[PDB]
């Protein structure tokens, strides 16, 4: 999925 500070 997306990272922890992704979007």
């Amino acid at each position, epitope marked *: *999925e*997306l*990272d*922890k*500070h*992704a979007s």
Partner: antibody
Framework: RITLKESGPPLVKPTQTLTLTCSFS??????????VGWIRQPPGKALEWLAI???????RYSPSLNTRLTITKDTSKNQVVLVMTRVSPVDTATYFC????????????????????????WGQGITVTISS | ALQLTQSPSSLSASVGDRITITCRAS??????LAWYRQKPGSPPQLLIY???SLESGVPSRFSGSGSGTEFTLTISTLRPEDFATYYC?????????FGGGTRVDVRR
């Protein structure tokens, strides 16, 4: 100055459980958005990402190793522990822990996330051999 | 999962050359990409974070550009300590993948 160092057994037998400890100084795992991750490198091979844990205690694992890994932190001792169960010979590798910056803050307000995009400081690495 | 392919896998060069290593991702990773240099027997060392920012204390001959699916690291004037293996790392999606590495060795 941030420094990290890995410790644990240099030798481990197949089916056994491997516990690796990352002891660090220069930052606290209670600092905002900080992370500590683990990466391994079998001899002669590429780096392989294993897991990471953040100060707010969110944990993430490599999907290929998810069932055998547990990562945990001990904030007051400045340590991060990674436990790998049921090791086999292919797990022989040099294991590194590393620091990941949290976003830059201004008067305690997050203003820059670019610094989280890298693992900026690494430990020397600890060589682990899996053989019976 | 997400694939990170480095090119070339191996590269020969001489002191003073300009080299550029490239890393391509199977899906866009925005600017969440880092480059590292790893010398034999040592841990990887951060050169460039967030695709193009120069890490503090890292020499200016190192440069990184690109975003999305294509990134490049260029060393403008190769020094002896640069004969090593370079890796790119994506941090947009879990797991935080590493490329296969590119070995830079003395040309002859």
């Amino acid at each position: 100055r941030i420094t990290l160092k890995e410790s644990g057994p240099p030798l481990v037998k197949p089916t056994q459980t491997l516990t690796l400890t990352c002891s660090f100084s220069g930052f606290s795992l209670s600092d905002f958005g900080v992370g500590v991750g683990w990466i391994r490198q079998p001899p002669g091979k590429a780096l392989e990402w294993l897991a990471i844990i953040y100060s707010d205690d969110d944990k993430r694992y490599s999907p290929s190793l998810n069932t055998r890994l547990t990562i945990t932190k001990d904030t007051s001792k400045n340590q991060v522990v990674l436990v790998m169960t049921r090791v086999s010979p292919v797990d022989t590798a040099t294991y590194f822990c590393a620091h990941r910056r949290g976003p830059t803050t201004l008067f305690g307000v997050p203003i820059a996330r670019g610094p989280v995009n890298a693992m900026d400081v690494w430990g020397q690495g600890i060589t682990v051999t899996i053989s019976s | 999962a997400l694939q990170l392919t480095q090119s070339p896998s191996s590269l020969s060069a001489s002191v003073g050359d300009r080299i550029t290593i490239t890393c391509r991702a199977s899906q866009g990773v925005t600017s969440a990409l880092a480059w590292y240099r790893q010398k034999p027997g040592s841990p990887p060392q951060l050169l460039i974070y967030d695709a193009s920012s120069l890490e503090s204390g890292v020499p200016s001959r190192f440069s990184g550009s690109g975003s999305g699916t294509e990134f490049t690291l260029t060393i403008s004037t190769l020094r002896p300590e640069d004969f090593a293996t370079y890796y790119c790392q994506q941090l947009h999606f879990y797991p935080h993948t590493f490329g296969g590495g590119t070995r830079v060795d003395v040309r002859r």
